[PDB]
Design a protein around this ligand. Structure first.
Ligand SMILES: O=C(O)c1ccc2c(c1)CCO2
Length: 167
């Protein structure tokens, strides 16, 4: 049994809810929240900008030190950093950004990072300002992630479409 509430069950291991991932993280304090990161961990807008704002910029400060030491992530890659006031840990995962021309096949590699964590609160990778089709992102998630994932879809309209169209 876990703390996650109000989710629709899609599969054995994937659950979905219309929710602000920031508000959900603040309520649950999950072991792992996933960030929709870029390779530079520049948390400007989208899920990343919202998570970082909720940490009062401490996520960005920590991320800048990580990059100064390690250099940029790979598209499809990840790193584990603090969850600050939102979670124990933040798994920063880089999905391909279609608005930069990145290979959508890297979306499966991105989701494979989730399998290193038993339970996660996450957004749909490469959705929103990363430009991918969220229906496709949900299909890749279900077909890739084997650990227990609780997905947070910001838009109510999109949430309803993801559920209605789910095979
Ligand atoms: O899920 C998203 O795409 C998303 C993007 C931006 C944003 C949020 C979610 C919360 C407030 O700011």
């Amino acid at each position: 049994v876990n703390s996650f509430s109000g989710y629709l069950k899609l599969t054995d291991n994937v659950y979905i809810k219309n929710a602000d991932i920031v508000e959900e993280a603040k309520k649950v304090k999950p072991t792992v929240v996933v960030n929709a990161a870029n390779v530079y961990l520049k948390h400007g807008g989208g899920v990343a900008g919202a998570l970082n704002k909720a940490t009062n910029n401490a996520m960005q400060v920590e991320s800048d030190d990580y990059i100064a030491t390690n250099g940029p992530l790979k598209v499809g890659g990840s790193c584990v950093l603090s969850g600050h006031n939102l979670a124990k840990h933040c798994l920063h995962v880089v999905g391909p950004n279609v608005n930069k021309g990145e290979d959508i096949q890297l979306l499966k590699s991105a989701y494979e990072n989730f399998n290193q964590h038993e339970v996660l609160l996450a957004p749909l990778l490469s959705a929103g300002i990363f430009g991918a089709d969220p229906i496709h992102s949900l299909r890749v998630c279900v077909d890739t992630v084997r650990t227990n994932v609780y997905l947070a879809v910001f838009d109510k309209n999109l949430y309803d479409k993801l559920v209605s169209s789910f095979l």
